[PDB]
């Protein structure tokens, strides 16, 4: 299965790429909202880890534009941890929302649960 990891912080992107690779997933990475939508169209990920704050176009609009054509599972990821943040993420079409910093094992288990469910 293929995960599109969308994070503008290169160290975080690498930690997630590393642990998802260790699980046997194929990883494609995007570092902004524009690259995210392009990789989405050309790679057709099974799941996207999408963080909320991105250059060019924001996580919310990425998720909102994706949902126009696709029900690919989206797991939002963000250092923003307020009720409003999680609610609007999920309302705008995230399936799950996970805060930074995260546990690598919990991340993997939420990716699994989402894939199991689609």
What binding mask, one character per residue, do residues 31-70 give for a copy of itself by CB under 8 A, x or -?
Answer: -----------------------------xx--x------
Name beta bridge partners: 107: none
Distance (Å) of CA 70 to CA 62, 91, 110: 12, 16, 20
Q: For residue 90, give both structure tokens.
A: 């999920």
Does residue 8 have a known ligand-binding role?
yes
> How many positions of this chain bind a copy of itself (CB under 8 A)?
5
CA distance 59 to 85: 11
Q: Does 100 bind a copy of itself (CB under 8 A)?
A: no
Is 51 annotated as ligand-binding?
yes
Binding residues (CB under 8 A) for a copy of itself: these are: 60-61, 64, 88, 91
């Amino acid at each position: 299965k293929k995960i599109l990891i969308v994070d503008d912080e290169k160290p975080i992107s690498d930690i997630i790429k590393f642990n998802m690779t260790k699980e046997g997933y194929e990883v494609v990475t995007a570092f902004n909202g524009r690259e995210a939508l392009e990789q989405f169209e050309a790679e057709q990920p099974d799941i996207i880890i999408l963080d909320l704050m991105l250059p060019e176009i924001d996580g919310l609009e990425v998720a909102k534009t994706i949902r126009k054509t696709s029900s690919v599972p989206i797991l939002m990821l963000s250092a923003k941890d307020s009720e409003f943040d999680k609610v609007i993420g999920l309302e705008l079409g995230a399936d799950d929302y996970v805060t930074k910093p995260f546990s690598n094992r919990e991340l993997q288990a939420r990716v699994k649960a989402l894939l199991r469910r689609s």
